[PDB]
Write a protein that binds this ligand. Structure first.
Ligand SMILES: Cc1cc2nc3c(=O)[nH]c(=O)nc-3n(C[C@H](O)[C@H](O)[C@H](O)COP(=O)(O)OP(=O)(O)OC[C@H]3O[C@@H](n4cnc5c(N)ncnc54)[C@H](O)[C@@H]3O)c2cc1C
Ligand SMILES: Cc1cc2nc3c(=O)[nH]c(=O)nc-3n(C[C@H](O)[C@H](O)[C@H](O)COP(=O)(O)OP(=O)(O)OC[C@H]3O[C@@H](n4cnc5c(N)ncnc54)[C@H](O)[C@@H]3O)c2cc1C
Ligand SMILES: CN1CCN(C(=O)c2ccc3cc[nH]c3c2)CC1
Ligand SMILES: CN1CCN(C(=O)c2ccc3cc[nH]c3c2)CC1
Lengths: 588, 588
């Protein structure tokens, strides 16, 4: 057991020192490596449960049982005297840089997971390259380093959501005594986009600075894995070349899908285009019903746009459908129109986009409802949000031998290993995992530590909390009510629930009984909390802390014995008592 | 064991039915009690794991071992045949109303704790009276039912905090693209006060409706306990009379203190007056440094006032002092002035309050700094926030025998019992307990269930979370860092910390490294989280959910394995790594 861990660590680590905190011979070697600017991992044996067994096991590689012992890429280098011999003779730098490969690690993809993996690996002395290339959208949109979340995802969408939230802050301010007249204030799209894009630009630059200061090689090039250790790269001049790496991490993410109908690619756009669009979209149609579709429709309506959402079947498929229906009902009462049970058939162009005068075009959308009836209406902008997919045929030659699933995602072990032993996959392309930015970052950092610092900790993908940033936000952690009932049976499920009203909404004359929360619990397991759900302002801040308690196995009694903080929205979770089975109203 | 519980339950329940869910004779008795509008507690013997022992023990009271058994105020009334006999002979109503006392429960004080206890007790058939009287302030201010939080505490102060927060929302809206000009907008104090007071009035009315609908007698009269079971009452016509009760709950709260200096009572005010003041306070001095002092100074400054705070020694004595200093530094950078190490000596009147034109007066304040230098400045309003105190001599004759501590608070057992066996105390007057509204509510409800429904659950007063609603909010749960070190020693404490920047602050050009959070952990107990601290927006929403995890004994490893929600402020708690011992900077 211990023997197999130590073998794996020695073979994989780039530069690793086995040391003790008390030893001055170890302090002597650490200081030498620091002066020579040699980064390395360190294992302190006097601080591990079974460091005494490891010390004896090191002898199988070095034939000595003492400390310090320094290894490079699986090879024993020497003890104190020998390392200082190499340093005094100017032989050290050459020894620590000898490798069968150009790099200890090549990361294909410079997004959430890839940048986190590459930076963490470099901390332990791995010689690392990060490759990133942004294939342009059909109308030619492109952006800088950092991936989907930074450039065309979580960051710009939450900034535009905040711009939408401030419209109701302006309305509320009158009732709290401020002298403004909300009816005479308007919004400027391009001023918003300029501020959002300036922030994104500071993140692009910050990542390039971060990589340089960690001695990571950044190549703005398209990568393709052609054999287990060879990556073919193509740069901006279509210069093709080949680099080699010991370990490979695939982290290339996904892009938006388009439906197979006339005019979609030619005349519609996706979220990839929306966040840097140089003109206001105007009267807009959003096709789809995912969290992307609803978040974008929501802030466009709050900025004063004429917005319609066309829904094929249900909202937020895969989320709790009671909460999804409450989300949509709020949006419809606050100025989002819905075309329900409806799909598109074709998009026709009536006016070309006026790139000169900074104006949208004009389009005719034709479709049909699910019973047979027809749809026909004109829009200035049409946004498709009908899912996202990887395209690993661009990234990965089928001869390498990496197994994909029926959706095109990489099949991995619980330590992110593919069917090719030195190749790993993280983030949205890892089959079956939640497609979220903090998941990708944790997977990447934790993997880098296992490869290059002898760590053993795995990423836990269960009960990962989420928030949908619709105009009224929806936070969740754990099972939906319908999934719990299917898994355990209705007689074993108890649901506590309540409406609430934010104190901030009282003076502002907002709605009494639209905010809502529930706990879905398992009777036969001490009323264990299976799922937590909340619709209300600041829902992500409310939900986050409870995710720790659910990870630790919270019960209803744990929520009951904890005291609330007053006045807050969150405290309503500490005093829930109305059950669904009782039939008593949840209103306040 | 079981037998001592049953005896305590039977003696103090007002009306209680011992039952089993399966029994149709029990269902027949339940149906008769409902039809006669007789409220009662019910104990289902087949839902308790030692119901068989309880059933046998009942025979010691009734001479029978079957269910149903009905008891009234300690006396066995009958089985099924006997209860129905009383019903059809019109004898039952008189039996269930037989009492040595006017009431099963008298609550002295109609605030957070007292209202909660009274409503819960009435649910189990206790005949209940709630007494409430508001002694006017020195200038004559008074208010309605509901206590300090509802009328002159948490509720109005968080509403005026929200009005202050909206000033920076107006500022931020320009950077997100809205056309308003913040420099042309001003605030109207009386409009805000009118909206706050209309909400408070709806709460006053809602409580009177709730007591009527639970059949609780509300007396707007001052109460005085003159013997264990006798309460002397004085009404608004100064008519004096005496009522008797079996159990007594003391829940009379505290009122603000004044310093013993010339002019304080005559010319200054307290928070009791501020929340309904008919004119804007104008240039204001706040004397004191409690959370009340800083919260009030903070919103007055955000509403455009010229505000100074006079601090005797430190801010937020008893809270973590690193966090307290950050709170004050933020206020001082955003337009609160501070007179540090300074106390007042007298207040002189220069102008009387102008009640016609709705304007404050004018005052001269003289004081001194701790080195002896003099303070002298004019203000329109002086607010004293120098602590709160009970005055139980107005509530409690000394011959009753209820023990008080050195501060005048009631010394209680861990089930809220005083030194007089039928008298209990809850809320701010219970010595040693956190003085918070949700604590008083939990204590009151849990106590009512133990007195009248045979419950055993105690209130848990440890690790109760708090939030200070200063202009930048401060949330906490558990020990301060200096208390952790004093208790365990510096070598056993590790502190993880980080600055952060809300995403909402980026486009708005707010500060990079003012928001801050830390976890104070115990090394030798598996890195147990002893305390959590966060300075930032929505800090109460952030903190609440983590209080459940701390209640269950969370460690740093539990925070690490839980995944963040992105983008949120709260997620920074899931990835902390910089220790204070390392000396590495916490800036981001
Ligand atoms: C509109 C939208 C909103 C979102 N909002 C949230 C939110 O609020 N919270 C949240 O947690 N998640 C959110 N997400 C999801 C989040 O963006 C993703 O889960 C995350 O970005 C996935 O990270 P990744 O590292 O797997 O891939 P990515 O971040 O997509 O990075 C992959 C990178 O590799 C590049 N690449 C691809 N092929 C190659 C190649 N052959 N060679 C070189 N480089 C290549 C890609 O162009 C890209 O730059 C949102 C997503 C979208 C689309
Ligand atoms: C400015 C301010 C802000 C606060 N903010 C918060 C906050 O954000 N969160 C929080 O949790 N707590 C807050 N508190 C504390 C909270 O108000 C108290 O902890 C809570 O109200 C205590 O409730 P209680 O039932 O003990 O007493 P109270 O709510 O004070 O009720 C006691 C009642 O009994 C009445 N009474 C007194 N003597 C008699 C008598 N002889 N006969 C009859 N009736 C009598 C009193 O007039 C009063 O109506 C704040 C307090 C202040 C002053
Ligand atoms: C009765 N039937 C139709 C509603 N429903 C939805 O999925 C739904 C809910 C709300 C909104 C708001 C806009 N679109 C919506 C669709 C399923 C149940
Ligand atoms: C050395 N001493 C300096 C003062 N200090 C405080 O506790 C404090 C007091 C008052 C204000 C007002 C704004 N920030 C403040 C900090 C730290 C300890």
């Amino acid at each position: 057991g211990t023997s197999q861990w130590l073998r794996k660590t020695v073979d994989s680590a780039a530069v690793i020192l086995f040391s003790k905190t008390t030893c001055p011979y170890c302090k002597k070697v650490k200081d030498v490596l620091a002066e020579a600017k040699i980064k390395h991992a360190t294992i302190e044996l006097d601080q591990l449960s079974n460091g005494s067994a490891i010390q004896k096991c090191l002898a199988s590689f070095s034939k000595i049982e003492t400390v310090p012992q320094m290894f490079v890429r699986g090879k024993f280098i020497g003890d104190s005297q020998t390392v200082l011999k190499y340093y005094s003779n100017d032989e050290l730098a050459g020894i620590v840089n000898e490798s069968k490969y150009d790099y200890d690690l090549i990361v294909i993809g410079g997004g959430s997971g890839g940048l986190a993996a590459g930076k963490e690996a470099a901390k332990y002395g791995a010689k690392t390259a990060v490759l990133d290339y942004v294939e342009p959208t059909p109308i030619g949109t492109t952006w800088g380093l950092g991936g989907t979340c930074v450039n065309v995802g979580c960051i710009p969408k939450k900034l535009m959501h905040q711009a939408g939230l401030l419209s109701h802050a302006l309305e509320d301010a009158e009732h709290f005594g401020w002298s403004l007249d909300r009816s005479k204030i308007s919004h400027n799209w391009s001023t918003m986009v300029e501020g959002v894009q300036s922030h994104i630009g500071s993140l692009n630059w910050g990542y390039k600075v971060a990589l340089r200061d960690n001695q990571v090689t950044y190549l703005n090039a398209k990568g393709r894995l052609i054999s287990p250790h060879e990556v073919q790269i193509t740069d901006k001049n279509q210069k093709v070349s080949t680099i080699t790496g010991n370990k490979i991490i695939l982290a290339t993410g996904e892009r938006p899908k388009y439906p197979e109908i006339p005019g979609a690619v030619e005349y519609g756009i996706t979220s990839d285009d929306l966040f840097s669009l140089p003109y206001f979209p105007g009267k807009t149609l959003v096709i789809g019903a995912s969290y992307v579709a609803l978040e974008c429709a929501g802030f466009l309506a709050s900025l004063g746009g004429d917005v319609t959402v066309m829904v094929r079947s249900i909202l937020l498929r895969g989320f709790d459908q009671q909460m999804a229906e409450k989300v949509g009902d709020y949006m419809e009462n606050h100025g989002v129109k819905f075309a329900k049970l409806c799909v598109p058939d074709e998009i026709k162009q009536l006016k070309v986009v006026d790139t000169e005068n900074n104006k949208p075009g004009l389009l005719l959308v034709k479709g049909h409802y699910t019973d047979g009836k027809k749809f026909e209406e004109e829009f200035e902008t049409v946004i498709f949000a009908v899912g996202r997919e990887p395209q690993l045929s661009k990234v990965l030659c089928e001869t390498v031998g990496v197994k994909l699933d029926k959706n095109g995602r990489v099949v991995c072990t619980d330590d992110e290993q593919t069917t090719v032993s030195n190749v790993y996959a993280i983030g949205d392309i890892n089959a079956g995992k939640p497609q979220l930015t903090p998941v990708a970052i944790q997977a990447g950092r934790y993997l880098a530590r296992r490869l290059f610092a002898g760590a053993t900790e795995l990423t836990d993908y269960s009960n990962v909390a989420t928030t949908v940033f619709t105009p009224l936000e929806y936070g969740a952690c754990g099972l939906s009510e319908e999934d719990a009932i299917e898994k355990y049976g209705d007689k074993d499920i108890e649901v506590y629930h309540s409406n609430f009203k934010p104190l901030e909404w009282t003076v502002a004359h907002r709605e009494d009984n639209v905010c809502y929360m529930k706990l879905v619990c398992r009777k036969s397991d001490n009323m264990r909390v299976l799922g937590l759900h909340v619709l209300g302002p600041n829902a992500g801040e409310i939900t986050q802390g409870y995710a720790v308690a659910i990870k630790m196995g919270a019960t209803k009694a744990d929520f009951d014995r904890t005291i609330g903080i007053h006045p807050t929205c969150s405290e309503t979770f500490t005093t829930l008592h109305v059950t669904k089975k009782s039939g008593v109203s949840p209103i306040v």
